[PDB]
Amino acid sequence: QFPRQCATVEALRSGMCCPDLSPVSGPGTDRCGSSSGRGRCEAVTADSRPHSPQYPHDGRDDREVWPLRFFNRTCHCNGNFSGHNCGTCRPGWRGAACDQRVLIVRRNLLDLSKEEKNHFVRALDMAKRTTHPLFVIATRRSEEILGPDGNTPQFENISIYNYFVWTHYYSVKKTFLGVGQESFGEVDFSHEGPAFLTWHRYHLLRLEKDMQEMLQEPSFSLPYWNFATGKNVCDICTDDLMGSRSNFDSTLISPNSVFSQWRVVCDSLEDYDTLGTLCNSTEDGPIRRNPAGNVARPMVQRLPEPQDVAQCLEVGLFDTPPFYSNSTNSFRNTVEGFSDPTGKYDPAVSSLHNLAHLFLNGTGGQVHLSPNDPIFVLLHTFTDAVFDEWLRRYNADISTFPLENAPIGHNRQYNMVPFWPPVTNTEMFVTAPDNLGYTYEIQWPS
Ligand SMILES: *[C@@H]1O[C@H](CO)[C@@H](O[C@@H]2O[C@H](CO)[C@@H](O[C@H]3O[C@H](CO[C@H]4O[C@H](CO)[C@@H](O)[C@H](O)[C@@H]4O)[C@@H](O)[C@H](O[C@H]4O[C@H](CO)[C@@H](O)[C@H](O)[C@@H]4O)[C@@H]3O)[C@H](O)[C@H]2NC(C)=O)[C@H](O)[C@H]1NC(C)=O
Ligand SMILES: *[C@@H]1O[C@H](CO[C@@H]2O[C@@H](C)[C@@H](O)[C@@H](O)[C@@H]2O)[C@@H](O[C@@H]2O[C@H](CO)[C@@H](O)[C@H](O)[C@H]2NC(C)=O)[C@H](O)[C@H]1NC(C)=O
Ligand SMILES: *[C@@H]1O[C@H](CO)[C@@H](O[C@@H]2O[C@H](CO)[C@@H](O)[C@H](O)[C@H]2NC(C)=O)[C@H](O)[C@H]1NC(C)=O
Ligand SMILES: *[C@@H]1O[C@H](CO)[C@@H](O[C@@H]2O[C@H](CO)[C@@H](O)[C@H](O)[C@H]2NC(C)=O)[C@H](O)[C@H]1NC(C)=O
Ligand SMILES: *[C@@H]1O[C@H](CO)[C@@H](O)[C@H](O)[C@H]1NC(C)=O
Ligand SMILES: O=c1cc(CO)occ1O
Ligand SMILES: [Zn+2]
């Protein structure tokens, strides 16, 4: 979403988000660290290429041509500075000059020490309770964003973790068209298309970046969850990590885990999609989780088996036409889990990433809420581990990532919605260690 600095009446009608870094000649003096050699407020490049015929409503919703319905110039940082005001570094660099390289390691959560496990859990929990220093979320569309008075912007403060949740909600939210008009849903800016892996890779990056600063711990790393063991049960649903089932309500988490205290954001879509609002920062319900508890749907009562991961890494084309959730022989679609581990599609298969989400039979299984269950974070580091391995074996062959006629949101150089500063899918399409400053301690089947 947007820097608080740009969440103003001033900045919203400038069409400009170029906040100051260190201004010692007053406001306006250091927009993008430009006094130093660091960045320069210039106009945003958006992808303009056409999307799939699937999306009818070009011109009705703020996510299109991101971020151009909000901002027309952003900071473009020079070299390896990064950030909204070019104040930090691009992934894989630190130091005052962004000249010292770094490489953190994401390990399996069950290999972590006793204290490491506790500190991760306590870190997630602190991220849930701590107000994001930088981003605030819009609670209304841009049409209503400056308030009734046309002068009180309708943005709320949001916690670090809940921001993570919000950005996911806002990329899947239905397009609202008008009251009484039933909103449009064949629309997904982060799933069922090639951007699924890059959207969720940046998603993790930003949360990791955020938790790193929160903790004052530059080398904190998001551990992963190996869910491709095929077990009957959730081997990370224990009070020492993520919480086991509550003995008083088998659909809630143990009162002996902090996550039993967590309360969700964005669990009122019938409000959002009938009045044209957005998920705001107010929490309500607790997390629901019921691993393997889906009596009605036996094909989602067991996690994927180790060779499934082995096979979906045999699919050598990243994606295939129509670049949608019914793509065949498409690596993205089969890891995302609409194809079976071989590559073949069937309206009935739910494997890998998808089945992991469905297996929890609860909050983590529901698209608009699923980051509320922090298992999400580990589910996806692992999915990002499969992705990062695929790019190692196929030397990052981006040729099959389409540049046009993907579902909207999914063209190769679309800015991933609603990440800020704008970042195109292709900048996440790289081998993470040499480029994004992280790697996975992991060993693959065969
Ligand atoms: C992966 O998923 C895709 C979508 O989920 C699948 O694509 C879908 O295929 C079907 C049929 O092949 C398409 O359905 C309609 O297609 C035509 C064209 O409609 C378009 O033009 C119309 C006028 O020009 C407009 O009114 C629409 O806005 C639309 O853009 C329709 O005429 C068909 O109507 C026929 O079918 C109904 C019943 O289905 C009959 O009762 C009617 O009388 C009529 O004869 C279909 O409604 C669908 O459009 C298409 N997907 C998209 C995104 O448009 C895709 O096939 C799948 N991949 C596979 C299966 O491999
Ligand atoms: C660059 O942006 C400015 C700001 O316009 C705002 O940008 C978006 C957030 C969008 O929601 C607009 O409605 C905002 O007002 C553009 O300048 C305005 O252009 C409109 C016509 O489109 C005009 O009525 C206003 O008077 C203009 N106001 C100012 C201060 O210039 C500008 O045209 C954009 N340049 C582009 C898109 O190339
Ligand atoms: C934040 O979001 C919640 C959920 O939509 C809003 O609360 C609901 O408001 C509608 C009408 O405003 C009521 O009918 C519901 O009963 C409310 N539900 C809950 C759980 O609160 C709330 O209005 C939003 N906040 C702001 C400032 O708009
Ligand atoms: C979790 O699984 C249960 C079933 O185990 C789901 O509840 C069932 O939903 C189906 C389809 O909506 C109904 O036909 C059944 O009658 C329901 N059965 C029971 C026992 O509730 C529930 O919707 C699932 N929830 C999630 C988030 O996956
Ligand atoms: C958010 O909280 C800050 C304190 O960090 C407060 O100063 C500010 O008024 C709030 N801003 C918004 C946009 O809600
Ligand atoms: O991506 C997701 C997929 C499913 C089920 O397919 O639930 C929640 C999600 O976030
Ligand atoms: Zn998702």
From Swiss-Prot:
Zn(2+) A binds at residues 168, 191, 200. GO terms for cellular component: clathrin-coated endocytic vesicle membrane; cytoplasm; endosome membrane; intracellular vesicle; melanosome; melanosome membrane. The activity depends critically on the nature of the bound metal ion. Catalyzes the oxidation of 5,6-dihydroxyindole-2-carboxylic acid (DHICA) in the presence of bound Cu(2+) ions, but lacks activity in the presence of bound Zn(2+) ions. Pathway: Pigment biosynthesis; melanin biosynthesis. Glycans are attached at residues 72, 80, 157, 280, 326, 361. Zn(2+) B binds at residues 353, 357, 380. GO terms for biological process: acetoacetic acid metabolic process; melanin biosynthetic process; melanocyte differentiation; melanosome organization; positive regulation of melanin biosynthetic process. Plays a role in melanin biosynthesis. Catalyzes the oxidation of 5,6-dihydroxyindole-2-carboxylic acid (DHICA) into indole-5,6-quinone-2-carboxylic acid in the presence of bound Cu(2+) ions, but not in the presence of Zn(2+). May regulate or influence the type of melanin synthesized. Also to a lower extent, capable of hydroxylating tyrosine and producing melanin. It is linked to Albinism, oculocutaneous, 3: An autosomal recessive disorder in which the biosynthesis of melanin pigment is reduced in skin, hair, and eyes. Tyrosinase activity is normal and patients have only moderate reduction of pigment. The eyes present red reflex on transillumination of the iris, dilution of color of iris, nystagmus and strabismus. Darker-skinned individuals have bright copper-red coloration of the skin and hair. Monomer. Interacts with ATP7A. Interacts with SLC45A2. This is 5,6-dihydroxyindole-2-carboxylic acid oxidase. The lineage of its organism: Eukaryota, Metazoa, Chordata, Craniata, Vertebrata. The gene is TYRP1. The chain holds residues 25 to 470 of 537 of the full protein.
